[PDB]
């Protein structure tokens, strides 16, 4: 089966290497929210 984008990985489709959550540093109330980094499952599209 000639799959479209055959041999193209998830990142080859421009998927972000890492998804990092926003970080909040409200100083008036003394709040701090760290950024959380979660990877994306990896896969490859078979050429045939």
Instruction: Give residues in contact with other proteins (CB under 8 A).
Output: 2, 5-8, 12-14
Q: How far is the CB of 7 from other proteins (least distance, A)?
A: 8
Which is nearer to other proteins, 3 or 33 (by Cβ)? 3
Which is nearer to other proteins, 12 or 37 (by Cβ)? 12
- What single DSSP character describes residue 11? T
Q: How many CB atoms lie within 10 A of CB 15?
A: 13
Q: How far is the CB of 45 from other proteins (least distance, A)?
A: 11
Full DSSP string of 22-46: --B--TTTT--BPPPEE-----B--
């Amino acid at each position: 089966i000639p799959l479209p984008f055959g041999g193209k990985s998830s990142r080859d489709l421009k998927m972000l290497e890492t998804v990092r959550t926003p970080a909040l540093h409200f100083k008036s109330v003394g709040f701090h929210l760290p950024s959380r980094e979660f990877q994306v499952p990896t896969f490859t599209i078979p050429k045939l």
